[PDB]
Write a protein that binds this ligand. Structure first.
Ligand SMILES: [Mg+2]
Ligand SMILES: [Mg+2]
Lengths: 333, 456, 50, 17, 16, 73, 50, 50
C-alpha cells in the first residue's frame, strides 16, 4: 500500500514504553527523549538489531501533532436493506418475475468503468406472501453470489425476522429454506464484505454496490418492484491490516527500499506490527529550516503506533510521556 | 411428458450358426458415449517449457473517484444524516478521505457534480491512513451543502485547480498507478490396466427392450479412456488448494496431489447465474449491462452455446416474447412459417414449421444460438429436466465476449512429449501418464446461465 | 574389497531446469566449489555420483 | 470414428478373430 | 539377479 | 428384481402421474421413481398415492388411471 | 519406472516398478598389494594410537 | 473429498439411487504410483429363421 508524502515519513512501533535508554531490551521498546530546555525531541527505540534513535524534532518547528484512535480508522461496511415497495404492492403479485440487479462498481480493476453485475430472480406464486418472497429472494441471491468457487466474495446476505428485528439471519448457498422457518420476514440485508490482503502487495480495498430492480407488470403498468435503502452500519473492518501496510512502506525510509527483489540477495526487515491487532496512530508533523538563506522547510513527520485494548491504555501513556518530556500539548484520546 | 425404458445396462457378473451381418449393430435404443474432444479442440493450444507454475500481466484502469469516510464541521464535530447544511456562507469544514489523493487548491465535486464544488484549503492533515482536508464551497453557494450529500461512501472526483490572476501560488499535483498479475498451475493424470487382445473384469452388457424378450482390442480402450481422462481433467477439473498455498490431498507417496482448475471452474468465477425459470427478461438484462459497460455497439454479438433442449427452450421463450408484441401483426408473407412444397398429392401442397434461433435486443445486443452435442451426455449428466433431456443441455454459455487480440481460453502443454507409456511385465500392466493444464486469462469475458437445480 | 553406491531421483527430474537465484555449484575432487552454468539438474547429480 | 453429434463408436474397439 | 560378472559377484536390488 | 409395481403419484404443483417399477419391495419402487424419474432434481415433489403389485391371473385389467381435469387446474 | 532421468529416456518397455523413479547402482571390486613390506619404513606419531 | 472441500458433502447427496460417474485419476508430480482402470462392453444377439 503506497501512500502519499508531504516529505519523508517515519514510523516507530511502540510495543512497550520505558523511562531510560538503559531499559530498552526487547524489540518494540520506545522512550521519548528530550532536553531539560525542551528544544529537541527524539525517540530512542529498540530495533530488532539494537538501539536506534529517531530524527531530532525541533520543538519550535512543529506544525501539528494529533493522535487518532482505532475506531476512527475502522472501515464501516455498507449495508443495504432490500424490501418490497409498498406503493407498488406489499405482497408479490402472482406470475411476475422479480429480478434484482446488484451493480458492483469497483470490481477487480481500479476504476468505476470496471463493473460487475450479479442477479437474483423469483417468479412469484399464487399464495406467496412477503416473507416467502424474501426467503426465496435471499436463497436465489446467495446461490449466485456466495458460491464456494468464486474468485472473491462480494456481499453478504442476511434476512431479518420481524419478531427479532435486530439479529441477522445469515443466508449462504448451502442454506436451504428448511433451515429458514420464520414466517415474518420484512427485509433482505445485503452487506459488503472484506476483500483479501497481502502486506505491501495487496492493499485494503472494497467493492461497493447498489441493488437495482427490474420492472414488473402490476396492473398493466411496468413498475420497479422494490426499494433499497442504506441502513446504519453494524460491522467494522479492524485497523490491523492498515497499520501493517503503513509499517511496510515506512520501513524503506529507514531501511531497505529493495524489498525482496533479487530474492536470496536481499536484506530482510523485521516488522513489529501484528496484523491481527488494532493500533492507535500519532502523527508528529514538523520541519527543518537552514541557517541564513536555506529558509525552505523540510516538512516531515514521525509516526508512532501503539496497540490498544478497548480503552486506549498504551497510547495515552505514550502521549503522557511525550507531553512531559517535550512540553507539548498533544490531546489524549 | 414421460419416458419409457428401452434398454438396461447390466454388468456381466449379474448374468455357431450363420450371421446375418458381420459388423455389429448399434441400436437407437442405446445411449452412446460422447467425446469432449470437439469442445476441447474448439480452443487453441499453447506450449510451455516445463511444468512450473506460470504467471502473466493483468493491466487495468486509471480513473478513480474516492469514497468519503466522514465529514466534519469547522469545530471538529462530525456530520450526521439528520443534521443541517454544512458550509453555510462559505464557512470552512472538514472532509475525511481514506487516502491522500487530492492536492492543495483543487476543486473537487461529490455525488451531485458541480452543484456543490469543494475547494481544498491546504494540505491533508494525516490521521492514521486517513487524510483530512479543510474545504469550502466554490460556486457562489450561500446555503451550504446538505447533510445527505456529505455521508460515507459518496464518491469524489477532481475537477481543476483555479487561481487568482495576480500573485498566485502553487496548487495541484499528479497521480500514478501500477498493474497486477495472476497465476495458473498444471495437473498430472495416470491410468493402468492389468492385461494381448481380450477383456478383463470390468465388463457390462447392454440389453434392449424389444417385444419378445468379438475380441476386445485393449490398446484402443486404454488410449480412448485415457484420452477421456485428459478430457475430463481439462474441462471438468477442480483445484485443491487453500489460500495459504497448501494442497489438501496427498497421494500414495505422501507427496501432495497437485490439481489445477479446469475450463468449467475457471469460467464460473465471473458472470455466472443460476436460474429457476428461463426468461429473456433475465437474459437480455444480463447481456446488456455487461455490454453497456464493456463493449462497443458494433461489438455486441453473443453466440449462446447450449445443448439441444436448450435450443427448444430458447425457441419457446422468444416465441412467448414475440406473442406479446401485439403491436405488430406477424404474417406468413414475411416469416413463411407455412410455405409451399411440391407434392404428388396436391397441386397447392403446404408445409409447416419454424424455430427462433436469434434474438436482437435494443442498442445492438444480438443473441445467436448454436448447439454443442456434448451437453447431452447421458453418462455425466444424471439429473433430468421435466421438459426432456439431462438438465445440462439447458445451460447457456457465452464464450468469446468481444475481441481480445489473443485467445482467452487455451490448453496448456509442455514442449516435446509430455505423455508417457510403460509396460510392467511380471502380471502385465500397461501404465500411461500425462501432465496437462488449462488457462483462462480473463474469466469475466465468459457468461454462464446454469439451471439452479445443478447447484448445491 | 567390494564397494557400492546408490542414488535415487524422482521421475520429475528428467528435464528439470534450474532458475538460478544463486549460482549452482559443483563439488570438485579437489574440494573446491566451482561455479557451473549448465541448467539441468541431472548434470549435477551425475557429477556427484561419480 | 466420432459421429457428428460427438458420439463415439464402440465397434472400433473390437477385433473380429 | 543382475550379477556383475567379474568372477562371481551377484547384485540383488529388484529387477533392472 | 422380483416383482412389478404400478404407482399412481402426484407431482406437487405440476400435475399427476403414472409410473411402473421393478423392485423387491414398494419401498424400493418409490426409490427407483424419485431417483430415476423426470423430476430427478426436485424429487421432493413426488407424492406417491397408491402402489399395488402386478399379479397376473386376471391377465386383462386396469392397473392405474388418473385424469387431470379443467377444474383441477 | 516410467521414465529415466539419468539416461533421459521417456517410456519403458520393461518396467522395474510402478513408482516414478530411477535408482542408479554402481559397484567396484578393488584391492592393493605390497609385496615386500620390509622395503618400506614407517614412523608414526603415537598420539594416532597405532 | 477432493475439490478443496472443507465443509463436507451433504447427507442428501449420499443416498440410494444417486448415479456416480468416473472423471479421471490424478496423481502427484513426485514419486507417483499406479491408479485407475479400463472398462469394456459386451454384445448380445438377436435371432430370426426361415
Ligand atoms: Mg465467467
Ligand atoms: Mg613396511
Amino acid at each position: 500500500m503506497v501512500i502519499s508524502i508531504n516529505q519523508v515519513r517515519q514510523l516507530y512501533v511502540a510495543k512497550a514504553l520505558k523511562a531510560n535508554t538503559a531499559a530498552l531490551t526487547t524489540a518494540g521498546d520506545i522512550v521519548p527523549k528530550a532536553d531539560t530546555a525542551k528544544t529537541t525531541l527524539y525517540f530512542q527505540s529498540m530495533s530488532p538489531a539494537g538501539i536506534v534513535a529517531s530524527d531530532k524534532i525541533n520543538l519550535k518547528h512543529v506544525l501539528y501533532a494529533k493522535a487518532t484512535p482505532s475506531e476512527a480508522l475502522a472501515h464501516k461496511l455498507v449495508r443495504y436493506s432490500v424490501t418490497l415497495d409498498a406503493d407498488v404492492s406489499a405482497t408479490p403479485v402472482a406470475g411476475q418475475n422479480y429480478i434484482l440487479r446488484l451493480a458492483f462498481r469497483q470490481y477487480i480493476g481500479l476504476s468505476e468503468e470496471d463493473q460487475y453485475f450479479k442477479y437474483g430472480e423469483v417468479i412469484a406464486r399464487s399464495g406467496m406472501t412477503a416473507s416467502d418472497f424474501y426467503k426465496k429472494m435471499a436463497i436465489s441471491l446467495a446461490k449466485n453470489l456466495e458460491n464456494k468457487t468464486e474468485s472473491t466474495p462480494l456481499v453478504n446476505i442476511y434476512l431479518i425476522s420481524a419478531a427479532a428485528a435486530s439479529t441477522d439471519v445469515p443466508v449462504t448457498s448451502a442454506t436451504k429454506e428448511s433451515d429458514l422457518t420464520a414466517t415474518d420476514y420484512n427485509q433482505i440485508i445485503i452487506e459488503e464484505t472484506e476483500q483479501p490482503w497481502v502486506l505491501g502487495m495487496m492493499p485494503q480495498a472494497f467493492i461497493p454496490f447498489t441493488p437495482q430492480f427490474l420492472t414488473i407488470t402490476v396492473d398493466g403498468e411496468d413498475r420497479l418492484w422494490g426499494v433499497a435503502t442504506v441502513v446504519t452500519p453494524t460491522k467494522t473492518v479492524p485497523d490491523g491490516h492498515l497499520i501493517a501496510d503503513l509499517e511496510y512502506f515506512c520501513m524503506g525510509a529507514r531501511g531497505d527500499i529493495y524489498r525482496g527483489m533479487g530474492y536470496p540477495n536481499i536484506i530482510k526487515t523485521t516488522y513489529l506490527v501484528d496484523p491481527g491487532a488494532v493500533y492507535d496512530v500519532l502523527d508528529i508533523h514538523y520541519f527543518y529550516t537552514g541557517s541564513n538563506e536555506s529558509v525552505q522547510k523540510s516538512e516531515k513527520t514521525i509516526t508512532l503506533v501503539a496497540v490498544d485494548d478497548g480503552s486506549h491504555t498504551a497510547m495515552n501513556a505514550l502521549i503522557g510521556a511525550i507531553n512531559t518530556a517535550s512540553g507539548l500539548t498533544i490531546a489524549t484520546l | 411428458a414421460g419416458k419409457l425404458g428401452k434398454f438396461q445396462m447390466l454388468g456381466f457378473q449379474h448374468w455357431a450358426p450363420q450371421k446375418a451381418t458381420n459388423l455389429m449393430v448399434q441400436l437407437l435404443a442405446f445411449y452412446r458415449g460422447k467425446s469432449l474432444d470437439t469442445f476441447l479442440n474448439s480452443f487453441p493450444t499453447r506450449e510451455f517449457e516445463d511444468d512450473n507454475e506460470y504467471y502473466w500481466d493483468v493491466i487495468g484502469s486509471s480513473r478513480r473517484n474516492i469514497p468519503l469516510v466522514e465529514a466534519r464541521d469547522e469545530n471538529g464535530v462530525v456530520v450526521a444524516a439528520n443534521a443541517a447544511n454544512v458550509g453555510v456562507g462559505t464557512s470552512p469544514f472538514y472532509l475525511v478521505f481514506p487516502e491522500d489523493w487530492f492536492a492543495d487548491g483543487e476543486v473537487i465535486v461529490g455525488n451531485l457534480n458541480q452543484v456543490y464544488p469543494f475547494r481544498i484549503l491546504g494540505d491533508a492533515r494525516m490521521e492514521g491512513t486517513n487524510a483530512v482536508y479543510k474545504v469550502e464551497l466554490m460556486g457562489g453557494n450561500t446555503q451550504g451543502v446538505p447533510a445527505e450529500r456529505l455521508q460515507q461512501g459518496e464518491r469524489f472526483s477532481i475537477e481543476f485547480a483555479p487561481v487568482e490572476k495576480e500573485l498566485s501560488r502553487k496548487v495541484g499535483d499528479v497521480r500514478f498507478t501500477s498493474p497486477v498479475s495472476m497465476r495458473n498451475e498444471w495437473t498430472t493424470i495416470r491410468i493402468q490396466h492389468k492385461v494381448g487382445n481380450k477383456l478383463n473384469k470390468k465388463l457390462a452388457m447392454g440389453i434392449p427392450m424389444v417385444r419378445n424378450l468379438w475380441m476386445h482390442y485393449v490398446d484402443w480402450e486404454v488410449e480412448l479412456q485415457f484420452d477421456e481422462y485428459k478430457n475430463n481433467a481439462m474441462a471438468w477439473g477442480t483445484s485443491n488448494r487453500n489460500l495459504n498455498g497448501e494442497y489438501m490431498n496427498f497421494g500414495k507417496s505422501g507427496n501432495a496431489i497437485k490439481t489445477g482448475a479446469g475450463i468449467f471452474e475457471q469460467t464460473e468465477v465471473a458472470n455466472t447465474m443460476y436460474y429457476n425459470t428461463f426468461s429473456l427478461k433475465l437474459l437480455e438484462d444480463a447481456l446488456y449491462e455487461l455490454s453497456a459497460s464493456k463493449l462497443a455497439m458494433d461489438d455486441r454479438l453473443f453466440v449462446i452455446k447450449t445443448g439441444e433442449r436448450g435450443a427448444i427452450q430458447f425457441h419457446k421463450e422468444v416465441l412467448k416474447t414475440v406473442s406479446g408484441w401485439t403491436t405488430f401483426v406477424l404474417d406468413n408473407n414475411s416469416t413463411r412459417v407455412v410455405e409451399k412444397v411440391q407434392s404428388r398429392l396436391h397441386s397447392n401442397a403446404l408445409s409447416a414449421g419454424f424455430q427462433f434461433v436469434e434474438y436482437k435486443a435494443p442498442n445492438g445486443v444480438r443473441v445467436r444460438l448454436d448447439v454443442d452435442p456434448f451437453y447431452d451426455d447421458p453418462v455425466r449428466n444424471k439429473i433430468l429436466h421435466p421438459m426432456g433431456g439431462v438438465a445440462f443441455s439447458y445451460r447457456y454459455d457465452i464464450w468469446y465476449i468481444g475481441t481480445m487480440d489473443q485467445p482467452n481460453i487455451f490448453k496448456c502443454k509442455i514442449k516435446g512429449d509430455n505423455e508417457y507409456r510403460g509396460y510392467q511385465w511380471g502380471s502385465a500392466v500397461i501404465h500411461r501418464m500425462a501432465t496437462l493444464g488449462v488457462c483462462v486469462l480473463d474469466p469475466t469475458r465468459t457468461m454462464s446461465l446454469i439451471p439452479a437445480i445443478l447447484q448445491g | 574389497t567390494t564397494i557400492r553406491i546408490q542414488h535415487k531421483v524422482a521421475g520429475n527430474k528428467l528435464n528439470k531446469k534450474l532458475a538460478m537465484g544463486i549460482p549452482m555449484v559443483r563439488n570438485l575432487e579437489s574440494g573446491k566449489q566451482v561455479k557451473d552454468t549448465a541448467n539441468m539438474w541431472m548434470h549435477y547429480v551425475d557429477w556427484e555420483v561419480e | 470414428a466420432v459421429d457428428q453429434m460427438d458420439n463415439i463408436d464402440e465397434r472400433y474397439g473390437f477385433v473380429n478373430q | 539377479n543382475q550379477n556383475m560378472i567379474g568372477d562371481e559377484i551377484t547384485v540383488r536390488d529388484g529387477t533392472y | 428384481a422380483m416383482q412389478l409395481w404400478v404407482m399412481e403419484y402426484e407431482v406437487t404443483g405440476i400435475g399427476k402421474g403414472c409410473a411402473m417399477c421393478k423392485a423387491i419391495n414398494p419401498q424400493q419402487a418409490e426409490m427407483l421413481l424419485k431417483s430415476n424419474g423426470i423430476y430427478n432434481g426436485s424429487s421432493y415433489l413426488y407424492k406417491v398415492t397408491r402402489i399395488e403389485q402386478v399379479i397376473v391371473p386376471p391377465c386383462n385389467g386396469l392397473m392405474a388411471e388418473q385424469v387431470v381435469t379443467y377444474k383441477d387446474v | 519406472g516410467i521414465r529415466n532421468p539419468f539416461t533421459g529416456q521417456k517410456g519403458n518397455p520393461y518396467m522395474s516398478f510402478d513408482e516414478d523413479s530411477a535408482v542408479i547402482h554402481r559397484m567396484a571390486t578393488l584391492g592393493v598389494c605390497v609385496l615386500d613390506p620390509t622395503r618400506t619404513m614407517s614412523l608414526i606419531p603415537a598420539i594416532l594410537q597405532g
